[PDB]
Amino acid sequence: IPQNAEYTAECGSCHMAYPANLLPADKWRAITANLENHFGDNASLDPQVTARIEEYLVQHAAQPQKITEQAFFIRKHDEIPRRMVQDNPKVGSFSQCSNCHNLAEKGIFDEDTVNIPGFGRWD
Ligand code: HEC
Ligand code: HEC
């Protein structure tokens, strides 16, 4: 099975499994160091599973903060108005990327395939 199989199961449980290359290693370690305190939820795992997740993310990282707080993310999304996101009940926030980028879990974020629920294709 592929290298991300366990990751997808464990970290795809409450939201989509974010590709490892969306954060650098130190930012992934800040998340996996205290999964019991995870953005309002408890994402704790057994220690050996935790360790394999951390090791996967660190190894495959971009070469606790959110993805949606990174400057690359804010830049890419700064023309999208709040009516389509925070005020859009079918979206609500940018965190669940797969609501707009249907193949986000496969790493596909291309603008030409984005479709915002309730609004349609962007391009
Ligand atoms: C439910 C018990 C969760 C599990 C299992 C995991 N995560 Fe999670 N994560 C959870 C919540 C409630 C949130 C906040 C969403 C909100 O809309 O703000 C998150 C968020 C993240 C993020 C940030 C997303 C963003 O807005 O940029 C990341 C990077 C993240 N979670 C990673 C992650 C990993 C690596 C997990 C397995 C160890 C994992 N999450 C599991 C809830 C839950
Ligand atoms: C719908 C409300 C979105 C959510 C949720 C996320 N993204 Fe997005 N993204 C969206 C649009 C409409 C656009 C195009 C913006 C326009 O002004 O061009 C994007 C673009 C990206 C890109 C760049 C894609 C390209 O072709 O260059 C990336 C890398 C990207 N988005 C990533 C991303 C991630 C990681 C998200 C969840 C944390 C995410 N997006 C959410 C709309 C929406």
Side-chain angles (χ1 to χ4, degrees), residues 29-97:
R29 286 196 290 267
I31 291 174
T32 55
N34 289 99
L35 288 170
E36 71 274 1
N37 184 14
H38 184 79
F39 303 121
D41 220 322
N42 182 334
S44 180
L45 307 171
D46 283 344
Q48 298 181 0
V49 174
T50 302
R52 286 194 296 272
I53 294 293
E54 183 169 302
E55 287 280 26
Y56 172 76
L57 286 170
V58 166
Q59 178 69 34
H60 300 91
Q63 298 299 299
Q65 299 180 191
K66 298 187 174 180
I67 296 163
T68 52
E69 291 171 333
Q70 309 308 118
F72 84 90
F73 176 85
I74 295 166
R75 181 174 64 254
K76 289 168 181 314
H77 292 83
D78 71 3
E79 296 293 349
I80 305 169
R82 298 181 63 238
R83 82 164 61 255
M84 294 180 200
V85 187
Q86 295 91 349
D87 298 335
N88 178 0
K90 306 177 174 62
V91 175
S93 71
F94 280 119
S95 294
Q96 179 87 320
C97 323

